[PDB]
C-alpha cells in the first residue's frame, strides 16, 4: 500500500481543500479547470467557505443516472481564478474493484489523515439516508460523520468520493470520467 | 513516505490497541514480552480496557531522566498470556531526527488513521502541561486531543509516542532502547 499512500498524499496536496457549507464541513476535490466535487449532502449553498475562505458557487449539478437514480455528487464550478490542475485522466470510465485502497480526509475534524480501508467492491444500489443510489464502492472500516467528501485512490486511481456509512461499512459514490465534460 | 506508511501499518496491526483508562482512551504500543507503553498522562490505573477488555497492570514505571525531569512515558506490564512481538530492535539509543515522519493513531474516535505529519526535529525541553519535559521531538501538525499514545515512525524506526500539542505543534516523547531492560 506503500504507493497508494504516497499517490494519495500528492493527490491531496495538489487537488483537494476543506469546505464548510451550511450543511457541514467537508473534503472537496477539485477536478480540472474550475470544477470541484462533493457529496450531493454537502447541499452547497450560493457560496461556500473553502479553506475558510467565501467562494461564489457559478453552477452546481446535483447527478443521477439515466433511470434518474441517486449518484449521491453534486459537481460546482467555482469563482475563482486559479485553476485545478487536471485529474481526469485518473478517473475510471467504470467502477474499480481494488484490494488495497486509502480514504484520504481533509477537515478540521480529521486534518491530512489517510486510512487503509482494504477492500473495495463494487457494491452498486444502496438504500443511503433513505434514498435509493447506485454506482456504490464498499470497503470494510468505522468510517463516521466528518469524513464525507474523503477521496478514495489506489495507486495510480481516483476511485470515488465518501459519501455514506452505517457504522460498520462506509460507502464511496464512483467519481467516473464521463461525468466531466 | 510510501514505505514509511507501509511499515507503519504494519507495526500497528501487529503491536497496538486502543485502550481506555479512567482519563481517557489511548493509542497503546507494545512493545516485547508482556509490556507496553502509554503517555504518563494516561495515568494507568490498576486495571486497564484494552480492546474493550479489562486487563490487569502488574506494574506501572513513570519514566523520569537522571535529573529526576519528565519524560512523560509510562510502561505497564500486562496480565495476559499473549506476548507482544518484539519491536525493540526498532527503538533509537537517542532521539532521532527525520525529514518525512509518520504519525499513526488507533482510537474510537481516530480509528487506524495515519497523518504524515512532515518533519521530526529534535526539540528537547518543552514546558508540557506545566511540567517541565525532556527528550521531546516536534513535528508541524495540528494535533489534538484523542492522539495520545499516537505511534511516530519512519521506514524502519519507531521514534516516539504522541503526547502534547500546543494547536499548532504536536511532540512525541522519544521511545529510547535503554527504557526497555
Ligand atoms: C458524511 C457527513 C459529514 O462528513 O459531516 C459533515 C459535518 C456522513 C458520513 C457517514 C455517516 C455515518 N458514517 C459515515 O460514514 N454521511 C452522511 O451523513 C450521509 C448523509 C446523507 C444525506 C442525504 C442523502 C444520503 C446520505 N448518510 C449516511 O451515511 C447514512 C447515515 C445513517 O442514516 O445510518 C446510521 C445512522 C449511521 C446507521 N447511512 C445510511 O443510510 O446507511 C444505510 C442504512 C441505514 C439504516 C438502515 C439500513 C441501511
Ligand atoms: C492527548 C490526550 C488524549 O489523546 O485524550 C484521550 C481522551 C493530548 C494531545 C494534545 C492536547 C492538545 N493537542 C494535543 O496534541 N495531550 C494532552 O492533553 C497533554 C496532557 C498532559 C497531562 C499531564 C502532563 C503533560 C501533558 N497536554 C498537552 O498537550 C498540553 C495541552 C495544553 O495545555 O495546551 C493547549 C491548551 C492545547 C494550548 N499542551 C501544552 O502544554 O503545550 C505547551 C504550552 C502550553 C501553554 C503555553 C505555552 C506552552
Request: aromatic share 10%; charged share 20%.
Amino acid at each position: 500500500m506503500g504507493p497508494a499512500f504516497e499517490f494519495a498524499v500528492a493527490m491531496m496536496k495538489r487537488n483537494s481543500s476543506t469546505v464548510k457549507t451550511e450543511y457541514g464541513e467537508f473534503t472537496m476535490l477539485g477536478i480540472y479547470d474550475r470544477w470541484a466535487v462533493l457529496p450531493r449532502h454537502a447541499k452547497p449553498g450560493p457560496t461556500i467557505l473553502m479553506n475558510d475562505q467565501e467562494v461564489g458557487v457559478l453552477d452546481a449539478k446535483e447527478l443521477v443516472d439515466k433511470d434518474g437514480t441517486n449518484l449521491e455528487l453534486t459537481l460546482l464550478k467555482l469563482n475563482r481564478n486559479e485553476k485545478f490542475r487536471d485529474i481526469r485522466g485518473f478517473l475510471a470510465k467504470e467502477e474499480v474493484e481494488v484490494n488495497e485502497a486509502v480514504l484520504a480526509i481533509n477537515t478540521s475534524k480529521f486534518p491530512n489523515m489517510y486510512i487503509p480501508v482494504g477492500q473495495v467492491t463494487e457494491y452498486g444500489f444502496l438504500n443511503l439516508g433513505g434514498t435509493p443510489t447506485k454506482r456504490m464502492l464498499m470497503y470494510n472500516f468505522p468510517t463516521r460523520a466528518g469524513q464525507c467528501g474523503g477521496v478514495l485512490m489506489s495507486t495510480g486511481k481516483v476511485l470515488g468520493i465518501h459519501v455514506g456509512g452505517n457504522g460498520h461499512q462506509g460507502f464511496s459514490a464512483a467519481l467516473l470520467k464521463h461525468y466531466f465534460n
